Design a protein around this ligand. Structure first.
Ligand code: 3VN
Ligand code: MG
Ligand code: MG
Ligand code: MG
Ligand code: MG
Lengths: 296, 296
């Protein structure tokens, strides 16, 4: 299978006067490239996919593809939806406009059954010829892609190559790789990046890497080389910021941190997301002081 | 406040060859009117709002409004979204096209904070002058509108008049009405329709009423008349079907039951929803035999 692995960043989407700041977006992607990141994920959960239009979703994918041209860095385009016809349309656009693969979140809100999840992802995978990474985050979607469903999709669909797990369930990570060791398990939960990698995971799709791309890149690379002492050390050092970046719903803390570090010009969200509380703003700022934050 | 209460039905959306069957939809709404229902909810969760287009969402609202003309039956239009700009647009269309109020589900997937939920619903409420019913269903959305947020929105926004609760939490129902007895608490959980009504709830937005509108209407109207003995009797009689209608994710079982009863011509969903397993298909058919299902 064609795969996209390694250290990856779920890119925030900066806004300026309620509009996608397209110049800042490219600048942020360049900073990720220059700090050892291997793939960028435009318009994931962290990129506020819910509140972008279908057009803006497509624009951000285009900026990512163009910015990564001439580099090793891959574009794993966020193209999921809770409507299969929407997810197929987004996947086809990403393929047609040069994305290296797609990240496709499990349908949210409408809670498909395991059979429905299978047909949803089968329709997506058969619509394009680029790699497809499943994305399980039951705390946000209200449903769970079971291990059996993931493994069936991996075995039945040529371009489905793994899953980004954001479920706080290391038991399931063992279940997945013990029964199907050929899939690419990707950490979608920064605090447990190292445990997932040490069990045979092959990458991360990170929130923290927006702020600290060099540290997340180093962690991942040490781990892929089985330098587990060094990878665990970085995972341990990162625990405090990894947790504080979820003191409110992601991406509220990470956008706050990027603003505090001078990496984005305005702390703007699209409703229903908004600025954090004054207390949490201060806690984010306090934890940031422990870490060395790369500029541009 | 202007309010919309009583026995209400979360309408299924019938499909024929992947298209909204508009004639079947109007016929189903008339059947609800003829069986004592006080309001209908087009394109809620049960109506597969997630997989309808914005335009099909607008078409079903028009059919509901047109079918209810010349009757007391109100149209409480499903107009929620996880993007505030989407929810405002849906609310404005519903108002402009004759809906009596809107049902607005809490944002799904992106998990707004309580502050974000407040600003989300304030923006919706300030965009129209018709009643707005909040809708809390954390098992599907991944977030919870707290009692404090619900009460603040009720007190601060003239047209926010209550909440549809589908959270399996009778403690919260006590919390809501003990601190704000002026709001309209609406049951969104058929099995516990009577306990919510007996605590001062003023209506239901029902899945089961799709199949048994006369029984849900009678239950609610008995309760509103403080004939709690007769209301509980119907609630107890309905428990078996109330639970089997969630043996798979709603609306998979209710559409299956409507098809088995001959009320819709095809068992068609839009992916990622699909037909139930053969076992659950048989379980639904078995539970239905206990009940008298009205025709057209
Ligand atoms: N990534 C950009 C697209 C965002 C669209 C949407 N906000 C809503 C998606 C939708 N399926 C639209 C249904 C519209 C008819 N009610 C949903 O709200 O479930 C989402 O998927 O979060
Ligand atoms: Mg097993
Ligand atoms: Mg090496
Ligand atoms: Mg209060
Ligand atoms: Mg309290």
């Amino acid at each position: 299978k064609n795969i996209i692995i390694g250290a990856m960043t779920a890119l925030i989407t900066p806004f300026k006067n309620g509009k996608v700041d397209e110049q800042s977006y490219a600048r942020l992607i360049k900073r990720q490239i220059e700090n050892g990141i291997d793939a960028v994920v435009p318009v994931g959960t962290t990129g506020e996919s819910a509140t972008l239009t279908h057009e803006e979703n497509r624009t951000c994918i285009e900026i990512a593809v163009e910015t990564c041209k001439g580099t090793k860095v891959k574009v794993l385009a966020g193209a999921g939806s809770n409507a299969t016809h929407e997810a197929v349309g987004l996947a086809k656009f990403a393929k047609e406009h040069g994305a290296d693969g797609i990240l496709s979140v499990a349908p949210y809100y409408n809670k498909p059954t395991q059979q429905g999840l299978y047909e949803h992802y089968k329709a997506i995978a058969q619509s394009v010829d680029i790699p497809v990474l499943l994305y399980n985050v039951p705390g946000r979607t209200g449903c769970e892609i079971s291990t059996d469903t993931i493994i069936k999709l991996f075995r039945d669909c040529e371009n489905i190559y793994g899953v980004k797990e954001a479920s706080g369930n290391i038991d399931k990570c063992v279940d997945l790789l013990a029964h199907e060791p050929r899939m690419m398990l990707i950490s979608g939960e920064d605090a447990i990046n190292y445990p997932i990698l040490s069990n045979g995971g092959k990458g991360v799709i990170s929130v923290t890497s927006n702020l600290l791309p060099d540290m997340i890149s180093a962690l991942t690379h040490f781990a892929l080389d089985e330098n587990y002492k060094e990878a665990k050390k970085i995972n341990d050092e990162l625990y405090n910021i990894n947790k504080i970046l979820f003191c409110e719903s992601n991406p509220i803390p990470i956008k706050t941190a990027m603003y505090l570090a001078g990496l984005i010009e305005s702390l703007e969200f699209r409703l229903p997301l908004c600025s954090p509380s004054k207390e949490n703003f201060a806690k984010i700022e306090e934890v940031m002081k422990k870490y060395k934050i790369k500029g541009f």
